[PDB]
Amino acid sequence: PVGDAFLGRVVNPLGQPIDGQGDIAAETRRALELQAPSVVQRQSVSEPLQTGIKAIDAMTPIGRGQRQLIIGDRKTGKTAVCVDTILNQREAWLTGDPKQQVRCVYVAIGQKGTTIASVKRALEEGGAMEYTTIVAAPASDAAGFKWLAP
Amino acid sequence: DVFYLHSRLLERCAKLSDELGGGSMTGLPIIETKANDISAFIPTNVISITDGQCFLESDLFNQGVRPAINVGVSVSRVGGAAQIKAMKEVAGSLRLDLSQYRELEAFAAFASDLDAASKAQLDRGARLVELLKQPQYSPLAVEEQVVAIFLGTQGHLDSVPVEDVQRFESELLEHVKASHSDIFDGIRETKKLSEEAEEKLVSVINEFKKGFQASDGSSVVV
Amino acid sequence: DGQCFLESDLFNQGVRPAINVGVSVSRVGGAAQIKAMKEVAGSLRLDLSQYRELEAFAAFASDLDAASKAQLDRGARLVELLKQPQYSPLAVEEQVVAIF
Amino acid sequence: ATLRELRGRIRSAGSIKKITKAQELIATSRIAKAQARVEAARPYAAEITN
Amino acid sequence: FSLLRDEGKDPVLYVVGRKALGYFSFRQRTVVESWTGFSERPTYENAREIA
Amino acid sequence: PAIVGDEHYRVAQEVIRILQRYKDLQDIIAILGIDELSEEDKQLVNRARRIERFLSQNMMAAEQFTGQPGSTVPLKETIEAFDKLTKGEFDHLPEQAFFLIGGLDDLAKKAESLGAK
Amino acid sequence: PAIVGDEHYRVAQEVIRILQRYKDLQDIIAILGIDELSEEDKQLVNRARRIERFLSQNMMAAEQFTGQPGSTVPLKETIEAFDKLTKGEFDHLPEQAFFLIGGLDDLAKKAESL
Amino acid sequence: LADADAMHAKALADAKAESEKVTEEAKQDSERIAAQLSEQAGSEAERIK
Amino acid sequence: EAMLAKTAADNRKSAEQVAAAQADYEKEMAEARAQASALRDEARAAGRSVVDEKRAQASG
Ligand SMILES: Nc1ncnc2c1ncn2[C@@H]1O[C@H](COP(=O)(O)OP(=O)(O)OP(=O)(O)O)[C@@H](O)[C@H]1O
Ligand SMILES: [Mg+2]
């Protein structure tokens, strides 16, 4: 299921809520294997996606529609960078103009549940949880959920 | 088909054409390397698939560089197209300054033998490295980043000690936001740093420097 | 319950038995020694590990303070004291006196 | 572990290379200064010899 | 030293610098006087004292 | 800093930075020797050797292996001691004085045992 | 030489030698400054800078970005031009004359433009 | 000497004036910072509510 | 002779004063700047403490 009702909610790879906050009203359904936009359905990437981090925003800028890999060893700050980006989107959200707003999806694959709870708490502190959805496939989930969460 | 797994996943993040609505999805895949081995199978696949890479390093993290992004190897194939005009202008010199500083870091202690230009390069690079540091959970608005990078790259940090740069920056960003927010407005609503705004910002920086107190008491004026 | 690592490089240097002190260890410790040996050799292994560390560190030290030179000399003497020819066992009291 | 210690040796050799190259450049500057000092000393030596 | 020994002479050793100090300490040769700490940049004061 | 406080975090970061720099300089010291470092790097190396020694401790469960009774150090004393170490207050004491001891009182006693104050 | 001929190979090797020795001087120049270099070294630096600038060219694809149209340089013209450059027959001219031009005719014309 | 003494006296006077000015500026901006932080604390407290 | 000595001393004293005036100037410039910086620092510390206690009471 897919819809605006998935903002602020934690779900599993099947879309079923796990935050214990009740049902999620689905605007519609969407197959996981729908083909990507074709080479002629795109346009050049020309809009900044401000991560709020000077290093990225100055040295390795990220535009809307881009795939920027965050790669490093453990405990190097990868999740910190991603959560910083999600939090930085808050002013754009408050603008109210969809051409500026960024909805955020956080897919947590294989993390222990308390780590996901910590990330959700951090997002709540910064108010990012109003425009963020978390898809959780904790370490205790079947390999199928870990494979499907992204 | 593991490469196919990740490639089909990540090719769905795209910037649609205006006919389809103009919407976009930006992907930030995370990859954990072991022993900083980016030539492993899955890191290799994902590095091939994506547009740019931000390489985070444990050694930089321990050295105090946080976020620990290795600007030497981190790349963004989109580049300036993903930056506003003010950011592209101010950040233009960062890459070369940092590369030259990393080349000269071996000569930290021999500044007497360094020619004036090379010692200036070394000092500027030290200030710039201190500039890119950022505390956790503290994203900066693009105008704030533009002003901070302007401080770094216009030489306004040359009179400040390294150990104070960060603090200086933050306080200055506060000062402006407290009393000269029009600079932030101009930048945000025009996406460029106009000449009048630049000169006003320079005057504000100079006044703040007259006000600023270094950690060791050294004057940071001029 | 522990191991005695033997190294050919130590063997060729004259350290016989070629026990690598830094990585060799017994997981029982003083419980496997008589009281006298435990008293004389309480921290010998740590002493020798630290001595090897310093010797590696002071390989090209143009000068050393008094403490470093004293530790190096003591460690060299201990390393010599632990060398032993084959088929030459020492009764426990002889070992206690030597370590003393 | 072979790869681990080989990478460690590579890192060590890289640091050594950097230090030695820096020292070589510093020694170039020092040669310049020492030759300048010899030149500065030359005239008094000539005069006292005369 | 060999030439002076051939000429029926005894070398009396003086040293400027520490490397020679170590070399002669190993050789056990006695160093009557030693000046160190200015090899990189000698001043006329050191030369005057030595002379 | 949110949980452990600003001073604890600052001291921990300083210790980690010093030890990382020491690790970086260790190979240079191995080959070229310590005399070819800058004065600040020499001070950092001495400080880092003392810090890494002081990080060691005589544990209660380790007496069987050493005969030395274990010791316990309060957190505040640990923070203060490592702040002093990173500031170079104990740079004069022999590094052996920092090996397998408890708090600052044990450090002073061991330094006295080695003929230093 | 078996494929491209003797003159082409000789000019190419001379250009490579000059550029390589300039690359060697890069580090000394950067850290210690250019004035630290000798007079022969400075002459070679000037010649190598001129050669590496002349290796630039105004590309046809560059027309869209910069209005100036691209140029095609015949191989023999390139060989003779770089033979002259390696011989120092252009050191007197400024560096700016050597950016994004074609053959010797373009070089001269831009020189009279400076 | 008379001119130097006059310059010293006027420099001290101008120093006192500017010191008062910068001190009042410091008080004003410190009050502004305190009010802003208190308002932010109230806002986040309302958020927690 | 006393007049010549007095003239020399007066030139020296004028040179001393043209420097001591600016010295005292800069001295109390720095004093005021340090006092202002300390006031700002204590204001920031007070604000941080106030927000922290607001956090605590709100959580309770
Ligand atoms: N900019 C920063 N400044 C200070 N500390 C930071 C910063 N970024 C991250 N950290 C800290 O570094 C540690 C690791 O950060 P983080 O968990 O984000 O990294 P990671 O690479 O995602 O880790 P993991 O392998 O556990 O998933 C945490 O203590 C985090 O608080
Ligand atoms: Mg993580």
Whose CA is closest to atom 19 on ligand 1? A77
What count of Cα atoms within 13 Å lies in the side-chain half-sphere of residue A101?
Answer: 11
The answer to whether B214 touches B220, Cβ cutoff 8 Å, is yes
Distance G87 CA to ligand 2 centre (A): 61
Verify whether the Cβ–Cβ distance A69 to B52 is below 8 Å.
yes
The answer to whether G73 touches G57, Cβ cutoff 8 Å, is yes
- What residues pair up with C3 in beta bridges, in sequence order? C25
The answer to whether G73 touches G107, Cβ cutoff 8 Å, is no
In this structure, what token pair is assigned to residue I32? 């005021």
Query: Which residue of chain B is at minimal alpha-carbon distance from I26?
Result: B219
Q: How many helices (H) and strands (E) are present in chain H, helices listed first?
A: 1, 0
Cβ-Cβ contacts under 8 Å for G95 (sequence gap 6 or more): G49, G50, G53
Please tell me the distance in Å from H17's CA to the nearest CA on chain I: 11
For residue B40, give the nearest of B86, B2, B94, B95 by alpha carbon.
B2
Catalogue the active-site residues of B. 77
Q: What does each C-alpha distance from H32 to A83, H36, I19, I34, I47 come to in angstroms? A: 31, 6, 38, 19, 11
Distance CA I53, CA A127 (A): 20
Question: Is the distance from the beta carbon of residue A54 to the nearest atom of ligand 1 less than 6 Å?
Answer: no
Counting as contact any 3 or more CB pairs under 8 A, the partners of I are: B, H
Counting as contact any 3 or more CB pairs under 8 A, the partners of E are: D
Please tell me the distance in Å from B175's CA to the nearest CA on chain H: 9
Q: What does each C-alpha distance from G79 to A99, B44, G84 come to in angstroms? A: 57, 43, 9
Would you say how long chain C is, in residues?
100
Whose CA is closest to atom 6 on ligand 1? B136
- What residues pair up with A71 in beta bridges, in sequence order? B31, B55
Nearest to B107 among D4, D22, D30 (CB): D22
For residue E47, give the nearest of D28, D31, D35, D37 by alpha carbon.
D37
> What own/partner pairs with CB < 8 Å and gap ≥ 24 does I18-23 have?
I18/H4, I18/H7, I20/H8, I21/H4, I21/H7, I21/H8, I21/H11, I21/H12, I22/H11
The answer to whether G78 touches G51, Cβ cutoff 8 Å, is no
For residue B184, give the nearest of B133, B147, B129, B139 by alpha carbon.
B147
The fold for domain B87-211 equals Lysin (1.20.150)
Count of domains in chain G?
A: 1
Q: Write down the residue that tokens 């070369």 correspond to.
A: B96
Counting as contact any 3 or more CB pairs under 8 A, the partners of D are: B, E, F, G
Chain G residues whose C-beta is within 8 A of a chain B C-beta are 30-33
- Using DSSP bridges, classify how beta strands B75-76 and B52-56 pair: parallel, antiparallel or unpaired: antiparallel
Q: Is C59 on the interface with F (CB under 8 A)?
A: yes
Distance CA A22, CA A27 (A): 16
Query: Residue B195 belongs to what H/E stretch?
Result: helix B195-211
User: Is A79 assigned to a binding site?
Assistant: yes
Q: Do chains B and F touch (3 or more CB pairs under 8 A)?
A: yes
For residue C56, give the nearest of C90, C93, C96, C22 by alpha carbon.
C22
Verify whether the Cβ–Cβ distance G31 to B117 is below 8 Å.
no
Question: Is the distance from the beta carbon of residue A74 to the nearest atom of ligand 1 less than 6 Å?
Answer: yes
Verify whether the Cβ–Cβ distance B87 to A84 is below 8 Å.
no
In this structure, what token pair is assigned to residue F12? 């921990």
Distance A77 CA to ligand 1 centre (A): 4
Query: Which residue of chain F is at minimal alpha-carbon distance from B58?
Result: F20
The answer to whether A54 touches B87, Cβ cutoff 8 Å, is no
Distance D4 CA to ligand 1 centre (A): 25
For residue A73, which atom of ligand 1 is closest to its CA? Answer: 21
Domain range for G96 is 1-114
The answer to whether F74 touches F103, Cβ cutoff 8 Å, is yes
In this structure, what token pair is assigned to residue D37? 């000092």
Question: Is the distance from the beta carbon of residue B66 to the nearest atom of ligand 1 less than 6 Å?
Answer: yes
Cα torsion at G8, G13, G19, G22 (round to 10°)? -140
Query: Which residue of chain D is at minimal alpha-carbon distance from F38?
Result: D19
Instruction: Tell which one of B66, B131, B166 to mutate to probe ligand 1, the residue whose CB is within 8 A of the most ligand atoms.
Output: B66
Identify the sign of the CA torsion C81, C87, C90, C92.
positive
Dihedral pair phi/psi, residue B190, rounded to 5°: -120, -10
Distance CA I54, CA G68 (A): 66
Q: Is B108 on the interface with F (CB under 8 A)?
A: yes
Query: Which residue of chain F is at minimal alpha-carbon distance from D10?
Result: F27
In this structure, what token pair is assigned to residue F4? 């452990």
- Read off the amino acid at residue G52: E
User: Is A74 assigned to a binding site?
Assistant: yes
Q: What is the DSSP string of F64-89?
A: HHHSPPP----HHHHHHHHHHHHTTT
Q: How many helices (H) and strands (E) are present in chain A, helices listed first?
A: 5, 4
Q: Do chains F and H touch (3 or more CB pairs under 8 A)?
A: no
Nearest to D32 among G27, G31, G36 (CB): G36
Verify whether the Cβ–Cβ distance I55 to H45 is below 8 Å.
yes
Verify whether the Cβ–Cβ distance B107 to G31 is below 8 Å.
yes
Distance CA H8, CA I19 (A): 9
Distance CA D22, CA B104 (A): 9
The answer to whether A134 touches A11, Cβ cutoff 8 Å, is yes
Whose CA is closest to atom 26 on ligand 1? A75
Dihedral pair phi/psi, residue I25, rounded to 5°: -45, -65
Question: Considering every ligand atom, which ligand is closest to the CA of B66?
Answer: 1
Distance CA F30, CA C53 (A): 11
Q: What does each C-alpha distance from B41 to A18, A76, B48, B50, G25 come to in angstroms? A: 33, 20, 11, 15, 40
Q: At what angle do helices I2-59 and B195-211 cross, to 10 degrees?
A: 100
Distance CA B219, CA C9 (A): 59
Q: Is I18 helix (H, G, I), strand (E, B) or coil?
A: helix
- Read off the amino acid at residue F70: G
Neighbours of ion ligand 2 (CB under 5 A): A 79
Question: Residue B32 class from Cβ within 10 Å (0-12 exposed, 13-18 middle, 19+ buried)?
Answer: middle
The answer to whether A116 touches A134, Cβ cutoff 8 Å, is yes
Verify whether the Cβ–Cβ distance F21 to B63 is below 8 Å.
yes
Query: Residue G112 belongs to what H/E stretch?
Result: helix G104-112
What is the CA angle H31-H32-H35, rounded to 5? 85
User: Is A120 assigned to a binding site?
Assistant: no
Nearest to B113 among D4, D7, D26 (CB): D26
Nearest to C60 among F33, F99, F116 (CB): F33
Distance A62 CA to ligand 1 centre (A): 21
Please tell me the distance in Å from C25's CA to the nearest CA on chain F: 10
Q: Is A1 on the interface with B (CB under 8 A)?
A: no
User: How many C-beta neighbours within 10 Å does residue B6 have?
Assistant: 19
Question: Considering every ligand atom, which ligand is closest to the CA of B54?
Answer: 1
Measured in whole angstroms, the distance separating CA B184 from the mean position of its chain's CA atoms is: 18
Question: Is the distance from the beta carbon of residue A112 to the nearest atom of ligand 1 less than 6 Å?
Answer: no
What count of Cα atoms within 13 Å lies in the side-chain half-sphere of residue A93?
Answer: 17
The answer to whether G11 touches G83, Cβ cutoff 8 Å, is yes
The answer to whether B145 touches G62, Cβ cutoff 8 Å, is no
For residue A82, which atom of ligand 1 is closest to its CA? Answer: 18
Question: Considering every ligand atom, which ligand is closest to the CA of B62?
Answer: 1
> What own/partner pairs with CB < 8 Å and gap ≥ 24 does B218-221 have?
B218/B161, B219/I30, B220/B159, B220/B160, B220/B161, B220/B164, B220/B168, B221/B159
What is the CA angle D20-D21-D26, rounded to 5? 95
Distance F8 CA to ligand 1 centre (A): 17
Distance CA A141, CA A13 (A): 10
Q: Write down the residue that tokens 């010692």 correspond to.
A: B119
Distance CA A108, CA C18 (A): 52
Question: Is the distance from the beta carbon of residue B135 to the nearest atom of ligand 1 less than 6 Å?
Answer: yes
**Chain H neighbors of I30, CB-CB under 8 A:** none
Question: Residue F32 class from Cβ within 10 Å (0-12 exposed, 13-18 middle, 19+ buried)?
Answer: middle
Candidates I22, I25, I26, I33: best to mutate against B (most CBs of B within 10 A) is I33
Resolution of the coordinates, Å: 2.7
Candidates F22, F31, F41: best to mutate against D (most CBs of D within 10 A) is F31
For residue A74, which atom of ligand 1 is closest to its CA? Answer: 25
**Chain D neighbors of F31, CB-CB under 8 A:** 12, 16
